[PDB]
């Protein structure tokens, strides 16, 4: 109901966790679990590559169609572009329904 | 090639199949008798500017011209051409005259 593709078997959850590296244990045995760990974080790169099937249009429509366009009118910032502080912003929600089809 | 037999069909279409597009048109024409079958010397009138003086000939012949882009492209086909392509050029053409009816 939020829009999208209903999948009985969706793309699976990809779960990630730093392995606990303990600090130095006591030189005598303690049966209690470790509460002291070396503080650490991880970083790295992640790649997703999705292949999408397209459905081309076969309209015999004469007049031109509504399409998503940028405006040529000047502005302080180009849409879908970083500003002078390096902050990327998206100005408006772009839906996907621009071409037409007869019922 | 008979009286009650069609000598051609209506082809008016546009097919986009990759790096090519073929645009086909079909129109109905009417050809009258020009100059009453005569060749005539035409020129500018004697009272005229020097820039506007001409000399030539008119013929009884008509001519077909399709040297306009709307002759081959619809506005929807022109919109497909201009929002998707950095360039275009013509490659070949095919011409037909058919279903000719001489009315007296």
Q: Is residue A52 within 8 angstroms of chain B, CB to CB?
A: no
Residue B51 structure tokens? 């820039």
At how many Å resolution was this determined?
2.8
| Long-range contacts of the stretch A17-20 (C-beta < 8 A, 24+) | A18/A42
CA distances to A1, A32, A36, A43 from A21, rounded to whole Å, are: 43, 16, 9, 16
Report CA torsion sign: B31, B32, B38, B41. negative
CA distances to A100, B6, B10, B21, B26 from B13, rounded to whole Å, are: 20, 20, 9, 10, 9
Closest by alpha carbon to B59, among B82, B73, B42?
A: B42
> Which chain B residue lies closest to A69 (C-alpha atoms)?
B83
End-to-end CA distance of chain B: 21
Closest by alpha carbon to B10, among B98, B69, B88, B76?
A: B98
Report which DSSP code applies to B15: E
Residue with tokens 């209690």: A32
Distance between A65 CA and the closest CA of chain B, angstroms: 8
C-alpha B76/C-alpha B84 separation (Å) is 12
Cβ pair B79:A64 closer than 8 A: yes
Q: What is the 3 state secondary structure string of B33-97?
A: CCCCCCCEEEECCCCCCCCCCCEEEECCCCCCCCCCHHHCCCHHHHHHHHCCCCCCCCCCCCCCC
The distance of Cα B61 from the centroid of its chain, to the nearest Å, equals: 14
| Long-range contacts of the stretch A58-62 (C-beta < 8 A, 24+) | A59/A99, A59/A100, A59/A101, A59/B76, A61/A100, A61/B76, A62/B74, A62/B75, A62/B76
- Exposure string of B66-95, with b = 16+ CB inside 10 Å and e = fewer, is eeeeeebbbebbbebbeeeeeeeeeeeeee
Under 8 Å CB pairs connecting chains A and B tally to: 13
Q: Is residue A69 within 8 angstroms of chain B, CB to CB?
A: no
The distance of Cα B40 from the centroid of its chain, to the nearest Å, equals: 24
Instruction: For residue B20, give the H/E element and its range.
Output: none
Closest by alpha carbon to A88, among A96, A75, A77?
A: A77
Residue with tokens 């020129």: B43
Closest by alpha carbon to B12, among A35, A60, A56?
A: A60
Partners of residue B13 on adjacent β-strands: B24
Maximum alpha-carbon separation in chain B = 58
What are the backbone angles phi and psi of residue B26, rounded to the nearest 5°? -145, 135
Tell me the residues of chain B between 75 and 104 that have a Cβ less than 8 Å away from chain A. Answer: 75-76, 79, 83
C-alpha A23/C-alpha A37 separation (Å) is 5
B69, B78 Cβ separation under 8 angstroms: yes
Q: Is residue B74 within 8 angstroms of chain A, CB to CB?
A: yes
Closest by alpha carbon to A94, among A70, A62, A60?
A: A70
C-alpha B90/C-alpha B80 separation (Å) is 16
B74, B14 Cβ separation under 8 angstroms: yes
3-state class (DSSP) for residue B21: strand
Q: Is residue A63 within 8 angstroms of chain B, CB to CB?
A: yes
3-state class (DSSP) for residue A19: coil
Partners of residue B16 on adjacent β-strands: B21
- Exposure string of B2-40, with b = 16+ CB inside 10 Å and e = fewer, is eeeeeeeeeeeebeeeeeebebeeeeeeeeeeeeeeeee
Structural determination approach: cryo-EM
Residue with tokens 């500017």: B49
Partners of residue B15 on adjacent β-strands: B22
């Amino acid at each position: 109901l939020m829009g999208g593709f209903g999948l009985k078997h969706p793309p699976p959850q990809i779960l990630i966790k730093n392995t606990p590296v303990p600090a130095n244990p006591s030189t005598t045995f303690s049966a209690a679990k470790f509460a002291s760990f070396i503080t650490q974080y991880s970083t790295g790169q992640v790649s997703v590559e999705i292949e999408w099937e397209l459905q081309k249009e076969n309209s015999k429509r004469w007049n031109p169609e509504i399409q998503y366009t940028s405006n040529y009118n000047k502005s302080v910032n180009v849409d879908f572009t970083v500003d002078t502080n390096g902050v990327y912003s998206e100005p408006r929600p772009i839906g996907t329904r621009y071409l037409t089809r007869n019922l | 090639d008979g009286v009650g037999n069609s000598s051609g069909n209506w082809h008016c279409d546009s097919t986009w199949m990759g790096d090519r597009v073929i645009t086909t048109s079909t129109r109905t024409w009417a050809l009258p008798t020009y100059n009453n079958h005569l060749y005539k010397q035409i020129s500018s009138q004697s009272g005229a500017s020097n820039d506007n003086h001409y000399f030539g000939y008119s013929t009884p012949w008509g001519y077909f011209d399709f040297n306009r882009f709307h002759c081959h492209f619809s506005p929807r086909d022109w919109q497909r051409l201009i929002n998707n392509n950095w360039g275009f050029r013509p490659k070949r053409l095919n011409f037909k005259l058919f279903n000719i009816q001489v009315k007296e």
